Design a protein around this ligand. Structure first.
Ligand SMILES: [Zn+2]
Lengths: 114, 113
């Protein structure tokens, strides 16, 4: 029985995650073993993994899809941090509002909300 | 504010996930769309993502870390499926037993308990 699935992003300096996952996405550090750092949300979700031929609407497949509960807030934080947005925001036909942007490690992040 | 973190694996054919995520890990299709297919478990944890200089014990950083309740059963399933194990099983210093293997898409998967 699968309890959690966690993506691991390779970096010589895990502290580089703080600016995006910590500050913008509001995920405090949950575990810090030095060679690995985990950022986590106060919430609480089924273990899942997705397999995709495109990101939808003809986009590239994002490395991670991160669902947030106040999209307009996250959007404003991203803008205030001066981060370029690669796609969106746009409301998709399948009933999400989302944008793509790059994280500190060049991963393509899909930030979405119901 | 973050409700979920889900990795997406790029593939021309999502159906190829069933052999590993479905048949070995016991995560059935929760959603099929079918440009995208999500496999899911009935268990929950905090949404999280990790950032690592190495996989631990000098290993490569695994693409995914997947925590399972019944390590010995998964290990047996893996072997019976004829899948090569790249690392382990071994019990690590940070209180886990784990092994690494490749998924259908070439991703390095850390299965741990
Ligand atoms: Zn990299």
């Amino acid at each position: 029985a699968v309890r959690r699935v966690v993506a691991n992003i390779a970096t010589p300096e895990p502290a580089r995650a703080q600016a995006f996952y910590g500050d913008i996405l509001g995920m405090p550090v949950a575990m810090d073993h030095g060679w690995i750092v985990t950022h986590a949300s106060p919430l609480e979700a089924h273990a899942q993994v997705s397999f995709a031929r495109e990101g939808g609407s003809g986009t590239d497949v994002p490395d991670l899809s991160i669902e947030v509960d106040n999209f307009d807030e996250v959007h404003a934080r991203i803008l205030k941090a001066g981060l370029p947005i690669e796609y969106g925001p746009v409301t998709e036909a399948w009933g999400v509002q989302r944008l793509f942007l790059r994280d500190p490690f060049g991963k393509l992040i899909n930030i979405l909300s119901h």
